[PDB]
Design a protein around this ligand. Sequence first.
Ligand SMILES: O=C(O)c1cccc2cnccc12
Lengths: 18, 344
Amino acid sequence: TTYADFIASGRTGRRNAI
Amino acid sequence: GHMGNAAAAKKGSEQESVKEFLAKAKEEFLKKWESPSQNTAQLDHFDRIKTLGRVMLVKHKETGNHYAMKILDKQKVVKLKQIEHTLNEKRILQAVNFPFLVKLEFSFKDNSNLYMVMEYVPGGEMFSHLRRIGRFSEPHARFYAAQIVLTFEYLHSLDLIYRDLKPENLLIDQQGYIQVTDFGFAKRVKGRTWTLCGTPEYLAPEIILSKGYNKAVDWWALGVLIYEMAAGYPPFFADQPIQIYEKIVSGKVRFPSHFSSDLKDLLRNLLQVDLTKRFGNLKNGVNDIKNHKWFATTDWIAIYQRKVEAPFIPKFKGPGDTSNFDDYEEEEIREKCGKEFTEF
Ligand SMILES: O=C(O)c1cccc2cnccc12
């Protein structure tokens, strides 16, 4: 599922800027 | 047509009143922009409480008011090539005035650090609430979105591009309204600009593709934010940024099945790769967004006046309560780089 893909991305935590 | 006479006259009059408000707000902004405030307090006026450079909860010794104190070591700003951004962020913060922008109450510097003391927003980041709750209902998402729309309408009228919209940068105050923080990538550019900056999930395609770009990147970012608030995850993600960027530029976006048709229509017009079709970038400006069906129930003036009952009030265990913020380390606080920071 899309939600599962999101968890698998490893980018669920706070995201840094470039 | 869509609107009868009465609604048409009401809408036109509202759009004219916006113009009149923005005109006065630009006058007020430019006066402070052209003569910024400096050295309005000092460190020993404050007890340091807890880490939230660095941002610390502090208590003003004489008023007991709490503040978030951003502490920046000058020599460390220099080595990281950030003098102009730091100067500019402070300059912007002391010149703007809007109900959804965090308020710089004091600033000062000393031999080692620069200090920005703003109103403490005790509710924490939207990011935490969104991950915890999972996703926001469309009315809940819309209440926040309306505040960003108004805030961008304000900033863009001052020729300010914000460039780092994301839930991490949106604080929730004690009444449940948003306070935008972190103007470190904002810039006062009338035309185009070219800097590669922002957060991967939120970058407009024209940034990724190394084009000159304009304030339309903020409207793209609003589309990403609305989607993330209502889905619980962003419209473009992947393991690594380069794969996210391929998705962003692809011109394709998929929506959860619980998204309303109105919301999908709005997002297809914000998340529009074609700058000639992207809402916020057309002849009708921000009005294409404000008048969209998804915002049909939004009373824009009531949002601005903060008269709308918020859908969510973070737990408020007291002033100086830090529980909506997470826990961090423990550093202490020690002339360096004097010329570089004269204007601060
Ligand atoms: O200005 C900030 O970045 C900031 C960061 C972390 C917590 C904050 C609480 N109140 C205001 C501002 C804050």
